[PDB]
Amino acid sequence: VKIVTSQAEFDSIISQNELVIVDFFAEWCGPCKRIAPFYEECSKTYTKMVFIKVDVDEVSEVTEKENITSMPTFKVYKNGSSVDTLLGANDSALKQLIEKYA
Amino acid sequence: MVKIVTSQAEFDSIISQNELVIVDFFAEWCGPCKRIAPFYEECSKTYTKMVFIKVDVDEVSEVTEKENITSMPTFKVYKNGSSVDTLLGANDSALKQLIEKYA
């Protein structure tokens, strides 16, 4: 699962893929680490969607622009725009979000 | 997509008609078991080399007593009809590791 290291790379991936999900994680956040393996797993089966990760401190610029309050946050983008957004680390909840779009 | 096994005969059959079987010993009274269910179902979709089954410890008492299941949940893997590895607890990272060890 691609970890995005810059604004440019974020803006680029989101703009030239019709379906992208982004997992806003951080190494200081336990729940994020908990759900990572499940996220990795889904990215394997739900091939209609591009899976990326963004470390909220690593790319501050993107977190402040995407307005992230709690941790983790999963946002999906369709055609370059924010469409759905889920807060927290629950497996079934995240499954339900992904299936909504693939 | 993950068979719930409802009898010892069926348990025995699957274990013996299949090269690799992983089994998730769950129960409806066990919170942890319910949490890890979606990950297990997901894994079954991708790690196709291996047959995933669930067994409810109380529904199939005879099996849980024979397989000597103490903690909940328990995942066992079987290669060629014999118990080969067993993981206790509901940890996504750990369960992945166990499955990856065989597919």
UniProtKB/Swiss-Prot annotation, chain B:
Substitution effect: residue 30 to S: Does not stably interact with OAT and fails to increase OAT catalytic activity. Does not stably interact with SAHH
Site feature Deprotonates C-terminal active site Cys, where: 24
PROSITE patterns in alphabetical order: THIOREDOXIN_1, THIOREDOXIN_2
Site entry: Contributes to redox potential value: 31-32
Cystine connections: 30-33
Processing and modification events after translation: The disulfide bond between Cys-30 and Cys-33 acts as a redox-active center and is reduced by thioredoxin reductase TRXR.
Catalytic residues (positions): 30, 33
Predominant location: cytoplasm
GO cellular component: cytosol
Domain Thioredoxin stretches: 2-103
InterPro entries: Thioredoxin, Thioredoxin-like_sf, Thioredoxin_CS, Thioredoxin_domain
Keywords: Cytoplasm, Disulfide bond, Electron transport, Redox-active center, Transport
Claim: Transcription regulation is one of the keywords in the record: no
Sample GO molecular function, one term: protein-disulfide reductase activity
Keyword Cell division recorded: no
Family annotation (Pfam families): Thioredoxin
Matching NCBIfam families: thioredoxin
Record function comment: Participates in various redox reactions through the reversible oxidation of its active center dithiol to a disulfide and catalyzes dithiol-disulfide exchange reactions. By modifying the redox status of targeted proteins, induces changes in their structure and activity. Reduces oxidized glutathione (GSSG), thereby acting as a backup for the glutathione redox system. Reduces nitroglutathione (GSNO), a compound involved in the transport of nitric oxide (NO). Also reduces oxidative stress by detoxifying hydrogen peroxide, tert-butyl hydroperoxide and cumene hydroperoxide.
Protein name as annotated: Thioredoxin 1
Native source organism of the sequence: Plasmodium falciparum (isolate 3D7)
Classification lineage: Eukaryota, Sar, Alveolata, Apicomplexa, Aconoidasida
Chain's gene name: TRX1
